[PDB]
A paper describes a structure:
Clinical and environmental isolates of Stenotrophomonas maltophilia produce an enterobactin-like siderophore that promotes bacterial growth under low-iron conditions. In bacteria producing enterobactin-related molecules, EntB and its homologs are usually multi-domain proteins in which the amino portion acts as an isochorismatase and the carboxy domain serves as an aryl carrier protein (ArCP). However, in S. maltophilia the isochorismatase and ArCP functions are encoded by two distinct genes: entB and entB′, respectively. A crystal structure determination revealed EntB to be an unusual, single-domain form of isochorismatase enzyme.
The S. maltophilia EntB (SmEntB) structure was determined at 1.78 Å resolution. The cleft that is located between the lobe and the central core of the protein is part of the putative active site. Although a single chain is observed in the asymmetric unit, crystallographic symmetry revealed the presence of a dimer. Analytical size-exclusion chromatography estimated a molecular weight of 61.8 kDa, consistent with dimerization. In our structure, Gln79 and Arg88 interact with a formate, which occupies the same position as the ring carboxylate. Indeed, in SmEntB a water molecule is present in the same position, suggesting that the mechanism of substrate hydrolysis might be consistent with that proposed for VcVibB. Mapping the electrostatic potentials on the surface of SmEntB suggested that this putative isochorismate-binding site is mostly hydrophobic, but it is adjacent to charged residues. The hydrophobic residues of the pocket (Leu3, Phe42, Trp95, Tyr126, Tyr1552, Ile155 and Phe181) are conserved in SmEntB and other structural homologs, suggesting that isochorismate or other vinyl ethers may fit into the active site of SmEntB.
Author numbering: -2 to 210
The structure:
């Protein structure tokens, strides 16, 4: 594999509740206001991790717990997925960092089986780091009365961070599942949660989120 030019991501432990940064914001998530986002959990982006070890194994198990939780409560579920064989003119500047992108292949495009979307769940075409850019995420959420977003997926310091700060700027309170995201390293993972906590959102563990939603 070579997504993000990484043949492999070395194993690292997910942060525990005691290791989370203090959120500057007072926002707390509510079942009737929140929407779940599963950010780019496609075979292409996950190949580099050892799926039997941390962080991916527990992160995938945690997104599966959040999907089951939302499906039992009518909480809207959104996924982002890029399409393969993007034209460089549409892919833009990210191609200068991460190459031409995934191919139109069953080894790249599909959301992994363990997190497969169900009928009635929105799968948005992902064009940029932020799930809101070149999409209708904001209007889909608004007309459903959802003004809170719970972010899960990969990579924490890139698309998850860009999506959180855009949600915040669009008046959508932003939450990130600290152990239902994964990244290039624990250092990148910690950096993402620390920056979100001081500027635009609230990192919480999956166990904490399941208890309050
Ligand atoms: Cl846009
Ligand atoms: Na490999
Ligand atoms: Na609240
Ligand atoms: Na409702
Ligand atoms: Na793998
Ligand atoms: Na691999
Ligand atoms: Na838009
Ligand atoms: Na509860």
């Amino acid at each position: 594999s070579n997504a993000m030019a990484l043949p492999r991501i070395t194993d690292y432990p997910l942060p525990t509740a005691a290791e989370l940064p203090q959120a500057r914001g007072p926002w707390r998530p509510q079942r009737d206001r929140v929407a779940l986002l599963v950010h780019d959990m496609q075979r292409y982006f996950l190949a580099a991790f050892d799926a039997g070890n941390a962080p991916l194994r527990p992160a995938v198990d945690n997104i599966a717990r959040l999907l089951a939780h939302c499906r039992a409560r009518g909480i809207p579920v959104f996924y982002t997925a890029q399409h393969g064989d993007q034209d460089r003119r549409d892919r833009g500047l990210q191609a200068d960092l991460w190459g031409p992108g995934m191919r139109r292949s069953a080894d790249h495009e599909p959301i992994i089986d363990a997190l497969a979307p169900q009928p009635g769940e929105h799968v948005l075409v992902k064009h940029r780091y932020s799930a809101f850019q070149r999409s209708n995420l904001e209007t889909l959420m608004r007309v459903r009365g959802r003004d809170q977003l719970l972010v899960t997926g990969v990579y924490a310091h890139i698309g998850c961070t860009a999506t959180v700060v855009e949600a915040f700027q669009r008046d959508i309170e932003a939450f990130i599942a600290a152990d239902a995201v994964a990244d290039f390293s624990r250092a990148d993972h910690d950096q993402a949660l620390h920056w979100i906590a001081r500027t635009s959102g609230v990192p919480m563990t999956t166990d904490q989120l399941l208890e309050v939603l």
